[PDB]
Design a protein around this ligand. Structure first.
Ligand SMILES: Nc1ncnc2c1ncn2[C@@H]1O[C@H](CSCC[C@H](N)C(=O)O)[C@@H](O)[C@H]1O
Ligand SMILES: Nc1ncnc2c1ncn2[C@@H]1O[C@H](CSCC[C@H](N)C(=O)O)[C@@H](O)[C@H]1O
Lengths: 156, 156
């Protein structure tokens, strides 16, 4: 129902789990280059992924290009530096949820230009540093989908 | 705040992500043997895990042993065969959330003896088969923690 954006993702396995997640939820995936792997990389193919789970994915050469072609109504940045928690905001159609790379998170140059209410954190206990990227995306996507009533889900 | 139970988990990487998840959330982890890896396996150590993230983990030789030593107040089984969704139930202290193996899910012999209201599914779109185990656990744990007010979380 919403759009998920990975800013310069590095590890193919995480992205593979995220593509499966987006196909299982109906969320659309955007990737902002440079990526840490070839798009034709095995770690997304031999991985167990179905080719139909791809192609609904948009790749953007730069962040600027992404903003200019998508014109997100609202852009959220998931960052352990955020103040409101992911479940304390009210998602709406038109929202884009952006995540940073596994080894460094979203650039301060980008975060600096975003409103405080749109930089959100997933809660963690003391001395936690961050969570695995694919797990962060799963938690965020499912919290948004829960708020939006799980439109599109079907019983098996 | 709650207890997470992995029934015969097979792949070390998933369990590694789950141990990091439980340490980041304060949830307690239980593993029901046989596991698919040695407890002394590298895929949980060279993985980037901190030894303190372990030892709060309980290993059980059998499911029966687990029931007899833990006496869960309520035991939930996460299964794509469940009717209520994970966010449609009201978690409470004392709950144990159980997940099945990556290649087969929880045995019907166990599911058959559980009440319908305690076999829960995470929603998915048409023709979805299941989600990655560590992602399923993350989504469930964070939904429960959200309901319980994120007790124990701290801002970084
Ligand atoms: N607790 C949390 N809250 C919000 N986003 C999180 C998160 N844990 C991981 N993420 C997301 O997962 C991405 C990859 S984890 C990146 C490492 C992190 N920047 C660090 O300095 O340790 C992050 O950029 C973010 O989008
Ligand atoms: N949509 C969903 N709802 C509930 N639990 C799920 C799930 N997707 C994965 N899981 C959990 O992740 C575990 C490993 S996935 C296991 C494969 C699945 N039994 C199959 O037949 O395809 C499952 O046993 C369950 O505990």
């Amino acid at each position: 129902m919403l759009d998920i954006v990975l800013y310069e993702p590095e590890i193919p396995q995480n992205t593979g789990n995220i593509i499966r997640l987006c196909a299982n939820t109906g969320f659309r995936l955007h990737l902002i280059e440079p990526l840490g792997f070839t798009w034709d990389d095995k770690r997304l193919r031999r991985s167990g992924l179905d080719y139909h789970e791809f192609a609904e994915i948009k790749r953007h050469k730069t962040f600027e290009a992404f903003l200019e072609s998508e014109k997100p109504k609202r852009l959220f940045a998931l960052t352990t530096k955020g103040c409101p928690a992911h479940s304390q905001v009210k998602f709406k159609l038109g929202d884009y949820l952006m995540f940073g790379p596994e080894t460094r998170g979203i650039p301060m140059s980008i975060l600096n230009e975003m409103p405080m209410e749109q930089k959100i954190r997933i809660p963690m206990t003391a001395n936690s540093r961050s969570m695995n990227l694919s797990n962060s995306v799963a938690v965020t996507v499912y919290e948004a989908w829960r708020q939006l009533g799980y439109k599109g889900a079907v019983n098996l």
